[PDB]
Structures are given as structure tokens and as C-alpha cells.
């Protein structure tokens, strides 16, 4: 009994991780392979949605720093024109007590009341003294924060903010994921800034938002090796006889499997009780992505802002961005005409006539868990009110468009129990020739950015084919702390082979 | 052959130390005793001079702050009237970059330029981190400074200032002496003040303090001397000691008088004692000691008390725009330190150095300033020019406008001014003092025992008292050997009227 | 209404503290004074008792190290002959796991089993490392113990021993009383002795102490008292004080006699003084103080001095195979502490607790053992069985063979035995003493001021001397308030003959 | 103008490193390649020599612990029979004051004089206390040692031994090359062993290493080379490289042959390369490197194996009663390292250095010893007398009785023996390697990249493998730049058969 299709390497999922595996498989051009996804549009959670009124919203952020030349090579290939990209300056602010405090927070306590500055400085002094004598390392995220910042800064920012982000207490999280850097505060730089009173770029696609990158990357692949859409939905994986079954009944035989779906779904699709049980020990939070389109020129108070962080309790979201700042093509042009749905204060607008722009746009994120639930019916309104309370929207601003989507698997949580589970789950799948990789494929946030995830797929294939170490998967500190320039979209294998076929 | 006079206990010198010995001897009224001094006016280096134009000057605007009730008892006995004393609150600043920084220098960085504050705070951060782990103690004054303040504050103040005071580099002095002299900065306190822009200025035991209404500090010692039986004192040329024969326990006076003693308390500089003894070994050891001379400069000036001056007491001068290290507004201590307003005086010169528009005697009121300048083999001074240089320094510091009228000048150089706490000091004293002790000589006092940590007038007085108490009652000489012990407590046990005098008095009535 | 007697200074109590006050007063010979004691024989709890069979036992130890020349002058004066004293070598042992471990204990773990040595060294390594980084000081005796010794050595000796001594857990006691010495171990010396297997060679002649030839320690205090003008002493029932009226400064004796004073030096237990004053506030504060009772047991036995026992001095007992915390072969201190050989005595019992085979009086020679047992609310003792338990304890520790013949026993219980350095002590004393001071009452002594660190005979003596020096000459009471200061120096200034007496005498001849 | 030969990848040198490159290139079977060596026999400085009398001696030691599955695969493929290998227990001893001190030295101070134990333990106590508080990293090999062991152990072993090894004082060497773990001594374990006097634990299966039955170590590389296609190798005089033109990527051989390359893997000493390149700048930088020469000495002797020396071990010699720093009983590794019993040989001399009694050829059995002596401008050696001195050293260390019959001797001096981890090494290499890289030259190996940390046979093999992987597949050269990473993990990902070959083979069957 033979499957409808047979390939050496099967890739499940066409998010960044799956596309990475596909790109390196395509480059190597050795073993046979194919990639499937239930979504007709590749990009997974790094896709970009659009509102009926033409406002774009990324559902999974954007890369700010690439750690790898290989990732760069693929983006350059996908979007090879200078005008394909806008290049912006890396910046950030924290919203604290009516102030926009620049990153890094501790280096700008100067902008807080003098009383708060005292509590913060006393906190770092204590922490700096203890660190001088420390002979152990922190065991929880919380301990890490305190040793690093002092109780002062920890209570102002780190603690409350991180709870808003992870939907889980900082006491319930590990810290290893943060890196090897010794937990020791830079007291001198902090006080120096307090006394003096004083206080890097990234590219973003011009059109299509982040999702446009992955569409263009996928378009470089040989179309007949892709199966995207309902015809590409996987319904079961038979690990014992290495066969996958799709929704439409198609069967696929594989020798090695690279699975980028959530590892808990994989265990279900495998009907593996042991893996399902191990898999349930993992924790994750859901996230709500909220989009707000509004009429008007970009407000003075807002400027060239990007990520904004919100520790305080006058708004449910933990971060927001002025998405309209990243690219003029993220929202409709001025000439386009749209009706006002409501004002920022939640009341009916004066006129309901479709009017001109220009427009700007805000995007934000709310976290959710069994330890921090959210009312889905009221969350949109609360967020908008939150934009008011934080002085991002005037109560008079006119809202032209709203976007609200909830993602069940939003963040894989770095809980104290994560590694105990992963060190069992991953090797067990490995023994079955299954490479489970990705944000939820391998569940490691420290390597959960688009560039990391992409490379997790690239390296899994490199392990399958060339016996390479999976460095990003098992040594995040090693890859994050170096320049990764060795692996290129064009390696010696292809140069030599191409040159050979030329004089032959 | 007998000497002209014989006493159980002879006291040489009638400064604070000798007078302290005399007072306890007089209170005990047991063994016979007498006290001699080459000066006709008692008070030693705690005396007061006056210019022909009527301006009083101490040897450093002395200030009474006592660690002993017994010292208090004697001052109260000598000057028993409420109006004998003015009581003040210390108003002090350090002169740094056109600013008056309040006394605990470190708590007032908030008054320095921001750039400087940074260097200071960085310095303390380092020091605080090394202190958390230190397992040794400082060996020099300099290491002590750095470990306490950080290189920042050390360079801005401590180092330059202390060289101006001691006429010796901080790296050449020990550090077992500064317990109650130099403040101990706390990181939190300091940074909290720099944040709040608020101040603090109560450190040290100098903060109320009483000063004598009349005659200056010297007036205290004259009044104390007057409590003694005059016939047991020998003050003047007739009291000048020329020779000390330790072997047959006899002293020789200038007029040839000979005095036999059983026990000698000597308050003259220990290096002079060696000479007077004709003892080569001691003269030698004596050489290994070090001291700095000091110039006391007085300046009287016409005018109302400038509000730019205010109620300043002693001001500190680390910077190089003036020769003096410390200065005081003496006219602030008492209305009797300078002539009253009605008195008429001619202007001698203007602060800038030029002649006065008129050489006619004019009224007051008046105010007064006293300066000190240190001198040594490592930091010489030009005696002919030093007076002018100081006046010029008063200008550069904005104490005197170039326009101010100088009515009175005073200048006097004291050879023995400060007993220098060098690194070699204790190595010398731990030989000199025991050797004198074996001859039944109690050498005590500012230059008698040469320890600055107990060199104030109250310490010195008590060195004399305690020497007598050891001689007579077998008391421990606590102030001499344990400065930290006496400075760290209230010494209230020893009184001008002890149980011994009460019991003997009440027995005399019943009999 | 005038009292039957009036003096400038009244001293209550003729223990070492009282006698100290009397001696300085007698030397000064200025203000008038007298000294009373309810006991006919001076010496207080530093006296020496005797059994009907002629065995001596010190009730309150003996001085091993004198910190003062003044104390020396007075003992020299009291017992001026060379043959008035024996001079012995200073040494000590701890009884641990069948071993006599020499002082100090930590430097001799070599004698213990290797397993136990491991735990000890491990504990001190930890302590050493923590001390390298410590920035706080110990708050309890227990913490002080651990930081100094480590848990290993602490559990073997310090902890169990100290609980047996103070009859109070170490966690309940302060540690300032131990001095200002940094709580930290000398790892190198301890590991050096474990490796070398040897201890520091005998420093002989080494630190020696002197002990009186006759009459025991109590003999010192009888002779000291005899240098006093007898008419100024009132010892006996005729000297028992029943009431102290602080307000009009009057003291009332048993026989009804009334004494008026200007200054009072009271060396009786400060809680008894509170009582005798009828001051409720004081009595109240006085309750906050804690003390343990002690049992002094004496055993006289027949035979030459056995090989196993050795040469005198204190022995310490951490373990639970005996109720006592320390003991000493008293008969080693002087041949006059017990009957000579020719004396004939009947065996009372054997060490095992059984009747002897013969009850006929027989020759000696003899030897003798003295030991102490503490008692308190947290560590009670059965007064009927304690003697037997102690004797059995002597067998268990291998001090007596079960066959050894017991000729004499001695058992006496002292209500006030040790003033306990509890965490609460200073909070109470810093109120009690100043308050008594404001009434011209100098409460001084082992129980007069309640401070064990200055509770030895020389210290207590000097508390008396210094109180008088404060009353008369305004001297600082150094021993009372700065024990670390006096223990850390050579106190040579104050002498039995001071300059005052020299000058005065020299003048009387002229 | 075209060269006689053109390949994609040219490999110079057929030692472990060169053969490593060749193995991976051969496995990949993609780009064309060839490998050249001036030696007719492959093995480089890991080859085996034989004396005329039939005694074998490794010139470059043997692997004790392999860090890579890939290295294991290749050794397995080359020597696939069970009886191709012997497997021994990995142990080690240090010769200190007449004793054989087992590894590790510190855990065995027990068998030294008690006085030495004292200095050692005292040293570690200091080190341990400073380590509690340290906030900086060691800057020299010497400081690292002091912080690790303390001055006591440093003086007894570390300092003297390492000078004998590196021919350079420890103060002149870096320490990063040693690893990343903090310099903190395990004091408890050290003192626990001294106390217990033992060196034991609950234990499990003992650690082992394998050694080739025949041909010695050099037999591995001969067999590894044999698995390569012979026509892609050029070994012997015909393979000697004399010139390297980096600008037009051409190499010239002794016999005038020219070889064009696209990428070069050079395993010859990097100084020689700079010379062969005629590149002034690289010659200059190259001068800043430092190395020591080494003498390898072999001694065949008659007799059964003496009980005094029985194990297949290294022996280390800190003391100055012998010029060599390490030695081993090679005859213990394999019966085939020396002539069999029946073989008859004449005696050349006795251990004492005197003529034999009879010059007749006599049977065995035989055993063998080999040892090493360093040499440099800071520690010269007399080449004429070195053999005798070493033999005499063997006597002084009680390895040879003065009566032992020496049947065979061996002496050979390698100019490039150890690449020295000097303080200036990295400053030089961080310029040299990258500059060669920019010319498409991968200089790799013991003296190719000059890093002792990764200079073992397995490390070197892998330097070759990873260089090929970087050239072809863009792999990270982990062994080259991250020794700590590769040494602290099990490297199992890279196999002699990877997916690429499985997929390719399986495809060719459809
Ligand atoms: Cl930040
Ligand atoms: Cl060396």
C-alpha cells in the first residue's frame, strides 16, 4: 500500500520556520521535498491582515534585528529593490506617570518625579552591593529582575509590565532564556544620567506589511512542491509508518518530517498519549491583536514613535505601535473617502458622511490566560478608552476603522517547567525522525522571532542533510551573541556545481 | 646640697594642660606642688592677642566644645556669669568654585556643578563596592580618604585641603587619628541629597558651642589661673625653665632658682624638654617627630557686617587662589573682639593694596577676620609678603571687596603649631614617652605628648588632670592612650567637687 | 531621729566585691565606712566548705588569670609567704566520645574518629567562607557559636555544653558578653593540627596559676578580710540586712540596729535589694532578669591518684552520659584539700552505688572530685537523685571505676548560681542600675550588677574597688561598663599603695 | 597558461587534519579535490617509527578521549575488527618525592609528607577565600594556577612541571585556552581525602580509551588514508610543496608540477606557509608566534614487566632529577609494540651507562619506555648528552634499576613540537587567519592554526572536516573558534554517513 505522494523530506507549515526549511531544501536541490500549509497565503503568524476599509495590521510583528546573513540573503532575494523597503531608526518608549520614558528605562529615570528617582536609585545601590558578593545565580524571572534592577525599578516597570505581557507572574517564570549575562546593575550610568539630566536602524517593507515578505519568499519556490490551502491541511500523522494524511484524503510518505505546527497539536495528530501528556505540561498565553484606524494628520505628540510599552494599569494592552509610521501604504491614501464609526470617547460622530483623509493607524496587543482572562465583547472598547487615558487618542479623534483578532496560541511561555517538558518531548519526536521546530513547534520564545524561526527551519534541514548542529534550537545565547555569516543562500556546493556544468 | 624649693609635683607650663594639672592638684590638696611658665600671662597657645587699634585675635579663633564635665566645671567656676558667655550654632562652609558648601562637604555635592557631582558620586560608588569586600584596614591618611570618599571627593577637597593644613602630603600621614575629625559619607544619603537638591549640615561635635564674651579664648585661661593660690605659681621670666636634671630630679630657672621634685609633669614641647635635659638619646628620638609652624593673620576692617558674610564662623579653603586654609569671622563670636562703633580709626589701606582716599580717623562699626597659613620644610612661606598675599586671597575669595577699608592688620608666626600625625609618629612616641616615664616625668599636652587627636583645649586640659590623677590616685591615663574611648563617650564621672572633698568638708563641720 | 550608726559609705556584703570596696576604702582612709554581711565568715560564694570527714570544696571556683595588679597586691598582702601558694600549669580537657580532648577543642579534633573530623572541617570551611563576606554581627550566642565554629564543631561541643551550663538554649542568649572578637574561625590552624596529628608542644613552664596551700579559695578571702579594721566589720546574724530605705538613706539590720549612709555599695543580689527596698518599679524590672541555680557536688574517694586521671584542672562535659557540665580533681590542687593518709575513714558506698564489703574505718591516702550541675525552669533536677546520678555519671565518663570506694560526699544547692546573659538582660540592667544610681546606690557584683563576663573573683573584686573610686575620686567604672576594655589590657595603674599614700607617709616623717 | 592539475579544493598535508579534510571531501563527493604530502607515509606528527631492533614509538601520542562521533566513525571504518583494538583504563600518575601520585594530584596529597600536605592545604584555603570575593578573571597561566590550587600546590607540581612542558615560564602564557569554568578550588574534597586517607567513591564503570593492536598510533592514519581513492593522493617527494602563489591560486611542487585550486586547505605550519607564500606581512605576523621543539626518546629493555610499573599510563615528572616531563610504558598498550619473546637481541648497555657482561644475543621477553623533553630559547638541551641524561633520569625516578639491560634506544627531535599558548598568540592569530581567509586559504591544524586547546588528533581531524564543511556547506568552524563549546558537549550530529548520502543512494535505486 503506497501513498499518493512520496518525498524524502516533508515540511508542515509555511510560516517563517517552514519557509526556512523550504529555502534550504530548495537551495541544496538534493533530496526530494514538499511543503504543505492549511492557509492559501504563506506567512503563518507573520502574516498581514487588512480591514474592509483598507487598513493593514501585522498579526505577528516585524524583525528589528537580523542575527543571520542567510536570513538577509533571502529577504534581499524576495524584495530586491531599494524601493521595496523603508529603513527606520530603532527607538522605543515606556509610558510612565504621564511621561514617555525612552529605552532603556533605567537610563531615563530622570524623567520621573524626584521621589521615584530616589526609590529607584536606592534599589540599584542595594542590588549593586549584593551582586558584589553573589555566588549563586537567579532561579526565577523575578529574582533575575530584582538582582538586576533593584526592587525600585522592578515595581515601577519590570514586574507589572511583564505580568501584562506574559499573563503570568514573574515568579512563575525561568530566567535562563534571558541569556548568560551576569545579573549586575550599571549603577554609575544610571546615577550619571540622573545628575546630568540628559540621556541603529531596521528595514520595513514598503507594501504588504510584514506578510508581504513571506509571500515574496514563498514565490521563489517551485510551485509544484507547495500545497497551500484547504488541500494542504494536515489531519493526521502516522509516525510508525511515516505517513501524513491531508483533509482531502491525500496521503504523503516521508523519510524525515519537519513539523512547524504547535507541538501540542502534533501530539494530538499523532495519537501519541505519552507525547500528549508531556505536551500538556507546556504553558502558553493567547493574544488579542487590536487595530484602530483614525482620521487626521499624524499628531505632534506622537512623532516618529514605534513600539510603546505600558506597565501601568490605565490600559489593558502591554504594547502599541503607530503602524502608519512604518509605511504610507499601511493605510488608505488621503483621497480615499471613509465614514466615521465613532469618536475615541465612544460616542456617535457629528457627521456620518464619508470624508477624505489623510489617515494614521494604531496597533496594540492584549495577553490572555487562565490567570488573566479578558472579556472578548468589551476588550475593543476598553483598548480604545485606554488609548485615551494614555493620551495617544484625544477624546475628539474620529475612528474610521477597527480590527480585532484573537490568537489561541500567542506566546509560548518560559515557565519554570518548560525545559523539563521540552528535554523529553523534542528528543522523543527526534527518535521518530520528526523535527518539531518553530515558535510553537519547539516552544522557545528566546528564539521565537521571525529570523530565529526561519533559521530553525534552515538548520533542521541542515541537520537532516549535512549533519549540522542545530545551534539556534539548543544554544540561543551562542547564536544571539555572534555574527552568523557562514551560511549563505549561495554556498560553495552551488558555486562548484554551477561552474562545473558550465565548462561541460 | 638642697635646691631653693622642693615640691612633690612640679608642673612646667601654664597652657590648658599645665592649668589642668594645677587645677586637679589644687582640688586634691594633698601633695605639695607648684607651676612655672616663662610667660607672665597664662594660657599658652590658647591665649589672645590685641592690636594697638583694639582688635583681638586668638591663635585660630578658638572654639570651646568639651567632651568632659570636669572641663565644664572649671570653665563655669572661672566664668560663672550668664553674660560671661556667648553661645552659638556652627555656621561653616567649604570654599569650592565660587560656592559656599555647607560643612558635611559630601552631603552638599548638590551645590557643586553637575559635572563635579558626577565625578564625586562615581568615586563613592567605587569605594562603596570595595568596602563591601575589604578585609584590611587603611595604612595612610590617603588610603583612608580614598576608601571613605572615593577619588572624586579626594581630589576636589580632601587631598588639596589637607596639604594646605598639614603642610605635608596626605600620603605621609597615618590615619588612626581622624575618628572624630573627618566625616564618613554614606552613598544613599549623598545621592538622595543630589536628587532632592536638599541639604544637611550638622555633622561633628562642633554644631551649639559657647565662646567667652570678653578677652577672647585667652580670657578663659586667665580666669582659670586666678582660681589658683598665687603663691604656688611662678609666671614670667622668673618662671622660665632653662635646665632639667632628671638624674637628681631638679629643675633650674632663668634667675638661677633651683626646684626639686618627686614627680614632673612637663607641658613644654617634648623636643625642647630633651634639649633642656641634655639627653642625647631623647634629643635624637625627638628629631624623628614632625611639626608645622603656623601664621596667624588678623585683618580689621571698617563697615557694617556685610550680609554676603552673614553668620559664617570658620570657612575652609581647598583651592589655590589663597595661602590660608581656614578663616573665621571673629567679630561674629563676640561684640567685644573689636572696637565699638564710636571709636575712630584711620584707614591703613584698601583691600586692593592702594592708599585710602583720606587719612583721617573715622567711625565704625567694625568687623574682623582671622586667617591661618601653615609652613614646613615641604611648604615654605615668604614672611615679608605673606600678609599681603593673604589680603589678596581675601579678595579672590570674595570675602573682601577691593574697596573695603583695612583699619588693622595682625601677623604672628608660631614655630610649633601643629603636631603632625606622620607615619613615623607612634614609632617615635612609643619610645620617647616610656623613657621619660621611667624618670618619673609625665610629658603631656599638644606638644608634650604630640598627639593631635587629643590636642584641643579640653583634651589638653584633661591630659594634665589625668596625669595628676595617675600620679596621686593611680588613675588610668585614658585620654593619652585611648583617644577613641574618650571621644566616643560622655565623660561625667570626674568633677571639680568629688566625694573626697564633700566627705572631708562634712567631717570638718562635725569636728 | 538619728540612726544608731552613721557612715559616709556603707558596704553590704563581704564577698569578693564587698571586700574589694572595703579594701579601697581602707587604703584611702578618708570617708568613714563599714561593711556588713549576714555570714560570720567572709568570702561570699567564693568561700570553701568542709565535709565532716575533712574534705574541702570551693563553692565558687578559683581565679586562673588575674587581670589587675591591684588584685595581685591584695592577695600578696593577704598571703605573703611563698609556701602560702602552689603554682600549677594551666590546662583543660573536654570529654568527647571516650576521649579527653585538650583545650582548645577545635585544635584537637585529631583525637576524634575520622568521620567526625570530616563533618567538623566541612562546617568550618563553610563558616570561613561566609565570614569572608559578612557585614553584620551575631545577634545570639547560637549565631556567634556557628559563625565561629561551624555547625559541625558547634553540635559536638559548644551547643550541648552551653545548654548544660546555662540551663537555657543558646538561641536565647546574647553574644556581646563574649567580647568584640570577630566571630570567625582559624581554619589553617585547625587543619594543620588534623594533618600533623600533633598538638602544639607543651609551652611549659607555660601559663601557670597559683592556688592557696590551705583553706581552699575561701582562705584567700578570710585573710583579705583580716587586714581590715575589725570594728568596721559587722559579720554574722548581727550584720543581716532586712530593710533598705532609699529615701532617707537608712539601713535596718535583723537585731534592729539602724545604719545611716551617704553612699551605699550593695553587693547582694539586685532582685533581693529591690525586695529589701520595697520599690515595686525596681522589683518589676528586676523580674525581667534571669538566673540559673547550681548544685555543687563533692566526692571523696580512697586510693592513690589513678593513672588515667592525670594532673588537675577543669574538665568539660558536652555529652549526655552525665548531668554535670564541669568537674575537677580538687585533690590535685593541694594536699591539704583532704585528709592525710594516716586518717581513717569508713567506705560509705562504691562508685557503682552498692554497699562496700567492709565498713571498718581504714587508712588512705585519699583523692577528691568536685563537679557542678545547673538547674532552671527549662532544665529541672531531682534533688533526691542528683547525687547518685552524678556519681553514676563519674563512672560513665571513666573518672571513677565502679569499684572505687567513696569515703565522703558533698551536696549543696545555690539558688542564685549564675546570672544569665539572656537577650533581655541589658534592656533591664540599663534601667535598673541608673535608677539605683540616682539614689546614691552602687549595686555591684556577680548578682549585684548581674554580668557574668565580669563575674570572676578578680573582676568582682575590682567592681567593688572601682565603685569606691567612683564615689570618692570620680574614677570611671571601667570593669562595670567596658569589660572588653579591661580584659584586653594590662591593668597596672591602680595599686594597693598609690602616690597619695606615699606622699602622705613621707610627709608624716618630715 | 594552465597548471598541470586543477581541482576545486586542494589539501596540503596528510596528518590527522589533512586526512580529516580528505575524508569529508570524499564523503561529500561533490567538488573535485586532491591531497598532497611530502611524506610517503600518511600520519604527520602522529605517525609511528620503529627501531632496527623492532621497537615501536609514537611520535605524537594517542587519543585518550574522542569528542566526536565523526572521528569515531572514521576510526571504526579504518579498523573494523574487534581485535584491531585494545581498550584500556585511562589513568595517570605524578612522580612527587618518591611517590606515584594518582590523578588528580590535589585529591591525593595524602601520600606526601605531612609537612607538604600542610603547605598545600594552607594554599587552597587562601585561594578559596579570595575566590569567594573575586570579580576579575585570571590574565596569565600562572595566576590561573594560583587561583585554582594555591601557592602550595603550584610550587610542588603546576609551576615546575609546566615549565618542563612548555619550555616557557607560566607567567608568559595565557589561560583562556584552559576553558571557561571559574578558578575555584574544591577545598572540601581535598581535605576530606587527607582526613580519610583514601581516594574512593561509590563508583560505576571505569573510563576507558582504545589503542590500536598493531602499527601503533600511526597505524590508524595509514588505514584511514587507505580508504581514500589513491589517485587523488600525492604522497612522498612527488608531493612536496615548495611554493604557493596566493594571487593566482597556484601551488608548485618539488618536481615542478603546478596545481591550480579554488580553495586551499593548508595543514603545514603557518610560518612555513607564509614563507612558501613569499608574503612579507604574513611572515612578520607569523614571527610573533612561538613554539617549542621536542625530543622523543625510546628505550627497549630485556625482562618481564616489573611489578613496580604495571599500568598503561602517562607519568608526569615535576622534579629536577630528570630532564623529561612525561613518560609511559608503551609495551603495556599492546604486545605488538615490541619484539616477541623468542626474538634474540644483544645488550647495548645497562641503565647505569656501563657495558654489559656478555655481548651475545639473548631472548626476551621485552618491555619498552618512551618519554619527552621540551626545548626552546629559554630552556636549551644538549642533543649529544640528552639520551644518557634521560636514561639516568629513568634510574633516579626508579623506573630502571641500574642493572636493567637496554636492548634498544630511540631518539628524534621535532622542530615544531608544541604550539605555545603565549600571551601574544591570539593577538597574532586574529590577524593571520582572517587575512589568509580573505585569500581563500583555510590554514588549520596543530601548527596550521596553532591552538593547543584543539591540537589533539581528534580535534585536528575535525578542524580539517569543519574547514571542508565551511567551504562547501557554510558550516560554522566550531572547533577552530569555540574550543570550549566543542569540548563541553557530545558532538553527534555529523556522521560518516549523513542524510545527503542516504537520500542520494536510495534515489539511485528507482
Ligand atoms: Cl528599557
Ligand atoms: Cl613556571
From Swiss-Prot, chain A:
Q: How is it used?
A: The UDP-galactopyranose mutase appears to be an appealing adjunct therapeutic target in combination with other drugs against A.fumigatus. Galactofuranose is absent in humans yet is an essential component of bacterial and fungal cell walls and a cell surface virulence factor in protozoan parasites. Thus, inhibition of galactofuranose biosynthesis is a valid strategy for developing new antimicrobials.
* Superkingdom classification of source: Eukaryota
Q: What happens when the gene is disrupted?
A: Exhibits a marked growth defect, reduced cell wall thickness, and leads to the absence of short beta-1,5-linked galactofuranose in the galactomannan and glycoproteins of this mutant. Strongly diminishes conidiationa and increases susceptibility to drugs such as voriconazole and nikkomycin Z. Displays attenuated virulence in a murine model of invasive aspergillosis.
The UniProt GO MF terms for this protein read:
nucleotide binding; UDP-galactopyranose mutase activity
One GO term under biological process is: cell wall organization
Residues where NADH binds: 67, 90, 92, 411, 439, 449
Give the cofactor binding note. Binds 1 FAD per subunit.
Effect in UniProt of substituting residue 90 to A: Lowers the catalytic efficiency by a factor of 125
Supply the name of the protein: UDP-galactopyranose mutase
Source organism phylogeny: Eukaryota, Fungi, Dikarya, Ascomycota, Pezizomycotina
Designated gene of the protein: glfA
